[PDB]
């Protein structure tokens, strides 16, 4: 079950992927809208992976210890600059958390891409499942690969004021390194925009 994704020029290869999990849609639609006068352009040299170290899944991590990332997260390079120069930006995400285990570690780690995470009380975690999600228990695999479209109350969005997606990685069953586990399993995230768009170029600063 090899799954060699690619976005732009930055592939990712994983030899244990359980499969891609499209959340809420198979393909984003209708970028060209009336709330811009057609002045939108589609940036294409900015759809590339970028790693973000998430957290240290350490064995003493009870149920429901979740680490929320606000997407889009602070970025640098070709992207990060697009946000720095465009009043309105729009993009659907592709998120690939690659926690790596020694296939002797037991826990059921649940990765979800929730829209507009504001507050989840300790109980809401039990139903957090109804969200584009994938479990990454080390025994069956390591790689969770969610892809989501752009959800929002607007065609386009202002990234400084609003972050639409919260990447939530909740520890469902704590890590038991019973005989030969990794002592502490780190968790990274290959996150990558898709179907980027921009509008309304900001003035210079210099």
């Amino acid at each position: 079950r090899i799954l060699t994704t690619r976005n732009g020029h930055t592939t990712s290869t994983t030899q244990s992927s359980v499969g891609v999990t499209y959340g809420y849609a198979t393909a984003e639609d209708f970028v060209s809208g009336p709330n811009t006068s057609g002045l939108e352009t589609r940036v294409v040299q900015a759809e590339r992976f970028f790693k973000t170290h998430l957290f240290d899944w350490v064995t003493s991590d009870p149920f429901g210890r979740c680490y929320q990332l606000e997407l889009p997260t602070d970025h640098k390079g070709v992207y990060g600059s697009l946000t720095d120069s465009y009043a309105y930006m729009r993009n659907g995400w592709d998120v690939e958390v690659t926690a790596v285990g020694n296939q002797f570690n037991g826990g059921c780690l649940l990765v979800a891409m929730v829209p507009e995470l504001c507050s989840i009380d300790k109980r809401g975690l039990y139903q957090l499942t109804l969200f584009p999600h994938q479990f990454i228990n080390p025994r069956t695999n390591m790689t969770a690969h969610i892809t989501v479209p752009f959800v929002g109350v607007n065609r386009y969005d202002q990234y400084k004021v609003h972050k639409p997606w919260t990447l939530v990685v909740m520890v469902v069953a704590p890590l038991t390194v019973n005989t030969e586990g990794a002592p502490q399993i780190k968790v990274y995230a290959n996150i990558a925009p898709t179907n980027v768009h921009v509008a309304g170029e900001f003035p210079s600063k210099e």
Partner: protein, 219 residues
């Protein structure tokens, strides 16, 4: 048996905007012939769209006297229809009573002066989210145009409408620190012997400007 109706409850109150029509009290009136009168406009977004009107400025006048010594910015104002610069135009006058405008706003800058003035201006629409520019070289990265003034006087820059919401409000006034719709800046990049000669700016509606949701505050 009489037809039963069971007149329901909570209905039939006088609603000032209801679609119902009143009950006739007088009949057979035959008003005199109103046909083929000279000037008839069906909806006010024809007057606003085909007849431009002036814009108020820092100095009370419609024009903007060219700056001379070092500063190239002539006018810079928020795009909301409540702006002091646009408060006197028929467009804002009509947009008091509506809530959400959508489409476009044209700005007709006609340069009035001596033939040898030969000035060169620039208008740029700085979207919201960053302090608006204060120098043409810093504003050039925006949706901006430039135009000489040789023979034709009027130049109509169609200010775009790009925003997240498919409709933006017509009222500037609330607790806001910064403009929501974005500044519009008008720079005079360079000028010849036209120093002291006015630029008469006008406003209008666009080929797709639309308002909706009528509401009357005490104007």
């Amino acid at each position: 048996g009489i037809f039963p109706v069971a007149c329901s409850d909570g209905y039939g109150g006088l609603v000032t905007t209801d679609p119902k029509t009143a009950d006739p009290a007088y009949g057979k009136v035959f008003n005199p012939p109103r046909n083929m009168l000279p000037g008839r406009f069906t909806n006010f977004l024809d007057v606003a769209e085909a007849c431009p009107t002036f814009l108020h400025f820092e100095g009370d006048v419609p024009y903007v006297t060219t700056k001379t010594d070092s500063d190239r910015v002539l006018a810079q104002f928020d795009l909301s229809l409540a702006a002091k610069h646009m408060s006197n135009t028929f467009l804002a006058g009509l947009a008091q009573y509506y809530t959400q405008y959508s489409g476009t706003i044209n700005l007709h800058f006609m340069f009035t002066g001596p033939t040898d003035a030969k000035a060169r201006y620039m208008i740029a629409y700085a979207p919201p989210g960053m302090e608006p520019p204060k120098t043409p070289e810093a504003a050039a990265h925006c949706i901006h145009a430039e135009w000489d003034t040789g023979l034709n006087s009027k130049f109509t820059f169609s200010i775009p409408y790009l925003s997240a919401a498919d409709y933006a409000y017509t009222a500037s006034d609330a607790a806001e620190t910064t403009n929501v719709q974005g500044w519009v800046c008008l720079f005079q990049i360079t000028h010849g012997k036209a120093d002291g000669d006015a630029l008469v700016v006008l406003a209008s509606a666009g080929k797709d400007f639309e308002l909706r949701l009528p509401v009357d505050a005490r104007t």
